[PDB]
Design a protein around this nucleic acid. Sequence first.
RNA 1: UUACUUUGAAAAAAUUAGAGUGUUCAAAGCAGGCGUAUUGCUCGAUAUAUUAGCAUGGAAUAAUAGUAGGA
RNA 2: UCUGGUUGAUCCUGCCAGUAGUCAUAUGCUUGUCUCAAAGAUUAAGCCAUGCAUGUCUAAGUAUAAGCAAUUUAUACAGUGAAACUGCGAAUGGCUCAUUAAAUCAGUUAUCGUUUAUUUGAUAGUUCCUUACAUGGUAUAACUGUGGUAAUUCUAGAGCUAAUACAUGCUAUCUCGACCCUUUGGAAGAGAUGUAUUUAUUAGAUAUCUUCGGACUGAUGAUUCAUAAUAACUUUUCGAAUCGCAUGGCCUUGUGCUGGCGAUGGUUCAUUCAAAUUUCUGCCCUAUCAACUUUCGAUGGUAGGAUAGUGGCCUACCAUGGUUUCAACGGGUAACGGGGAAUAAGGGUUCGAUUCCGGAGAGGGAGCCUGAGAAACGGCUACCA
Lengths: 177, 140, 67, 246, 65
Amino acid sequence: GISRDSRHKRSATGAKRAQFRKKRKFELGRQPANTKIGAKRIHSVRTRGGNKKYRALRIETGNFSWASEGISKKTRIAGVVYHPSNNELVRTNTLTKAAIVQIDATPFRQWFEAHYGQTLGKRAASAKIESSVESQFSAGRLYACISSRPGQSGRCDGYILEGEELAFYLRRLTAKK
Amino acid sequence: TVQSERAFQKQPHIFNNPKVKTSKRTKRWYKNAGLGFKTPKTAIEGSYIDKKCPFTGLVSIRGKILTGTVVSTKMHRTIVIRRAYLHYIPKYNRYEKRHKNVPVHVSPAFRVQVGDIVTVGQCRPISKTVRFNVVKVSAA
Amino acid sequence: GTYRKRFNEKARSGHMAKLKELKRIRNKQFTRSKVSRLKKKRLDKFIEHQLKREERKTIIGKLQDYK
Amino acid sequence: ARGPKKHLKRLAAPHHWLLDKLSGCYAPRPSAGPHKLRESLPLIVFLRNRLKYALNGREVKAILMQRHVKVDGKVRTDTTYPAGFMDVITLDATNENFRLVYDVKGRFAVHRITDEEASYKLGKVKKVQLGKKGVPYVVTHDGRTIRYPDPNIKVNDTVKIDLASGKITDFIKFDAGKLVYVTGGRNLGRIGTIVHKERHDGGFDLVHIKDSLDNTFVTRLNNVFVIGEQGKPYISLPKGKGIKLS
Amino acid sequence: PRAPRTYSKTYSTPKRPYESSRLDAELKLAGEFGLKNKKEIYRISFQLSKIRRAARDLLTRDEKD
RNA sequence: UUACUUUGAAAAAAUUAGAGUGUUCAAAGCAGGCGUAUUGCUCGAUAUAUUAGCAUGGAAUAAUAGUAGGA
RNA sequence: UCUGGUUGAUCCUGCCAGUAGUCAUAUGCUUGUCUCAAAGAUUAAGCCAUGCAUGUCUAAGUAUAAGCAAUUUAUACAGUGAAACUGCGAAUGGCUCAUUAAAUCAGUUAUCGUUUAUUUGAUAGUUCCUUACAUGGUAUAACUGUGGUAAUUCUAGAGCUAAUACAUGCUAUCUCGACCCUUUGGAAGAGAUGUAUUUAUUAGAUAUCUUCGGACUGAUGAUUCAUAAUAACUUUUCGAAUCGCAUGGCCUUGUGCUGGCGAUGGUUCAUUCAAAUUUCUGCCCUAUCAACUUUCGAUGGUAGGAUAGUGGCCUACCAUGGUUUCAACGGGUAACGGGGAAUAAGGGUUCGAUUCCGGAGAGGGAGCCUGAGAAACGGCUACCA
């Protein structure tokens, strides 16, 4: 029932176009897959061509990368924090692209302790990192931006919010609280 | 200001590393749109973020290159130009004036007042109605 | 044409429905049986004349009262 | 229309096939292959309508299935195979090789060809890229992909290709003063030397060409095809040698 | 769906049909040449009219055109 | 600089206008034929901006640019 | 586009008379031969009995038919081959012109903005990495048999058995090279080694001696392009358990090791047949239709969702825009658009349902399944008739 032609719209002049032809399958749409947090479940929609497309209905874990030194780890997603389109999505815990979620820290801090010979909280020039990230580690959860499309690839991948990113989003969260 | 909006603005896939300290506090990626249109230093060294600027965004300028005389400059980042031509009535063997108004997306690298003559280039559908992108101004 | 008087509107039921939709929202701009018409017109004239008759008779009564 | 078409009318055919307008209602729609729809000659239009070695479609199919016809060394059994331009079709039981090349009038001319000349084939280098694992390849004008080319082979060139091995024997650069064959538009079939390449950025590059009687014409880069150096063509030219006269 | 044949009418009745000088003209022609039809006369008349119109247009062209 | 004008490439076949050919003539239809075929010869098989876009030569006509001041 | 008339004879204006053809539509009488050829119309795209119009097999996917052929090398099979599974086609063709007035369509562009069965050309050793590859596994059809119903190309329960269906799944090559002796080199040792999916990161920049022999990345007009590299991730793909004809090479004589022609399939690019969107300009009558569009997306910004993918396409949150006397919006259209047809001296006018091209439709709304390709109708589902 979801179709995306441009012939049901008003013209640019504000005229109204009468129907030209019956609706077509090569301009269809499909129901949005509200990905939520929970045990994994992934339907696979069959797409034009023979192709596939993995809608994620519920996803729990994810692949998140620390950009600053350039590593990637599989973590767990705790819950949505902020979403630049719908505070309703934040309320309902719906993962989509560009979301801000709190993720578990343990794989990252273990890699850190094991790579830089130093614990977190409480070559040292390289071991020196950002105050905000250190604080989040002390708490146990990080702010990370989901940067994939769970309705198109069945995945939550993301990056950990570094300096300017994190500054901006902390201001937004604090101002909206 | 740059970050006046609910999402963060950035050139996607351009990353400024905290652990390395560099002179310019932000890294810009810019290109030239070819066709001898020199890119403006305000774009090279500005601070705005535009997905659609032909010099810093992800749009390529190809196909038709047109000229217009601005008419409204009075919504956000888009303008509406007027193209005036002389249609020809073969029965009366003489002419008649016509125009029609073409919305165009304008990068914030340009200051366009109403009345000045712009050169625009064709790009992929930017919005419902706007296909061209201001690629050079010329004051009037 | 768009709104013609078709042969079978009953078989064209839905076509008529969407045409009525199109018409109503196009002429939202403006809005935002002939012998039956004649019978109604003459009924209006006849009732108005009877009203004239009764009002005239009442004025006759009032004038003969106030003489 | 909800999918590819499988039929071709007779009036709608490419005109250069010289198909009569009354013998039937349909024309051989050429199967997909090396050459485009409109600039290809199917094997039935070549074996029946030009060579007159057949009289029917069923005779043409009998010949092919008896496995006589080879189009660029490989045996082709599809009766609407789109044999194209600069192609080599060999009929061994007749001991003939045919280079398909254009006649002055526009049409495909049969060009009888000897064995040592049927051994190879020219191809207009048309897309040079860098394939997976970093090996670069050229794409010629009839689909052929050729890997590990000479680094000095650039788009719009000619490469002479050994058919027996699918390899590149050598090549010719697109510079002024080469000899040029023309394959599109009003002048196709006209061989001349390439004088100027007026190049527009964003539009179509035009080419100014000059045939042996010093008559000049202007065509597009899409339609130029470099054959050989001055005065020596790499292929054997059909009679008249691409001179349009009165 | 086939390609249509080309046909064409081979004559054309003259402008004003009944005109006594031409009635007698056709009489003399039919009589001395054995014909049978104003239609045969009109066939030749049409052929020749076409020919002479061709020639006239060529004359109005320039020499050596 | 543009309008405008010249030449050019582009505007499917059929249809139209032409050329060739004794379909028995005709309406039509259609594209080679001779040879010492071992290396040659002959002919005819062109045209159809009516606007938009594209390249191009322009001197007029109609618009549109652009000398001064001080010592 | 003219011909006759008035008055003694003449010129205007006028009146009268006089005329035309129409693949125009109806109709009337006649209708012998030869070649050719068309065969719509009630503003009814109104309703249909019956038959037919889409199936398909090569040597090469699966046969123990309780099929046929005997018979002659065929005790696994082997010729021929119904049935059924599997593969493919059924999306083309053919028909009509209802809708549709910047829509269609025509000429002209773009995809640096996307899918593509097929065809065609290229293309996939990963040697190792602790506890069958002389080749895993279970189903199901046809068939045998027991039945149901007024009836249909309806089908239930039970018993068998196959695969190119289904689900699983295993079997060295190079860089340097001390040394050796020098050619024809061989060599201890040092090291490196799939694809696909998703994200992040990085690269893809480029204004003197002599034995005379030898030593001192690309493409575009333009790219976040092609391509390469790092770390991870994946209900995860692929990396041949298939088939025909042959029967050669070797020998440690093992029913050992090798090997020929071609069928099918398979990832990733290229091509081809397509497809989807899109740039510029161009439509008939209407101003006694002058304001239009915006809640209910109208114009734009951002983020997301959706898609093969661009985009108000959709949803949020923002601004308050967009078209218009150069005629927007509305109404009409016995309006599918073009190639073309008729005709006039030109200029124009009228016709184009109708042999080719494009579009749309299959009684009317809507909806979906398969598949590379359908919003299909000689496919399916419900609603009106």
